[PDB]
Amino acid sequence: SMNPPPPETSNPNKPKRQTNQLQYLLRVVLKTLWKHQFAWPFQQPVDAVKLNLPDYYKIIKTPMDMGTIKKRLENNYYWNAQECIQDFNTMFTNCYIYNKPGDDIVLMAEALEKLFLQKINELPTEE
């Protein structure tokens, strides 16, 4: 019926650092995923009102999208690269949870997930 507030993208109390891994996650991984033809359902939080999906935020309790991930990286929100990778993982599993095997949106998520996994397999060593 009503959308929750979007996930936090900035907290001035959180300690910050810039690493080559987080740089890679923003400059390569997110950049590549963003421009993929199937990215568009994932570029912003699910607006369950506009989409008229009253059960979405009843089923999905940890929302995540790429707009939020991107603002996180841009804000130096992430200390660990694994925080960011987990957020991409939550976004994908959210899609598979709410929707059903064989739905168009699930086929789109799957293709995005394989691209993501390929790019994280080439994640540089901390340096």
Binding site for ligand 9S3 (CB under 6 A): 40-42, 46, 50-51, 53, 56, 95, 98-99, 104-105
CB of residue 36 to ligand 9S3, shortest distance in Å: 13
Cα gap 125→110, rounded to integer Å: 26
Nearer to ligand 9S3, 23 or 111 (CB): 111
Q: H helices of 1-127, where?
A: 20-24, 31-34, 56-59, 66-74, 81-98, 104-121
CB nearer ligand 9S3, residue 105 or residue 123: 105
Is the torsion defined by CA of 50, 56, 57, 58 positive or negative? positive
Judged by beta carbon, residue 10 or residue 40, the one nearer ligand 9S3 is 40
In the numeric block, the tokens 């991930």 are attached to 69
Q: What is the C-alpha to C-alpha distance for residues 79 and 87, in angstroms, rounded to an integer?
A: 13
Q: How far is the CB of 3 from ligand 9S3 (least distance, A)?
A: 12
Q: Nearest approach, Cβ of 117 to ligand 9S3 (angstroms)?
A: 18
62, 94 Cβ separation under 8 angstroms: yes
Q: How far is the CB of 1 from ligand 9S3 (least distance, A)?
A: 15
Specify the residue, 65 or 73, whose C-beta has the smaller distance to ligand 9S3.
65
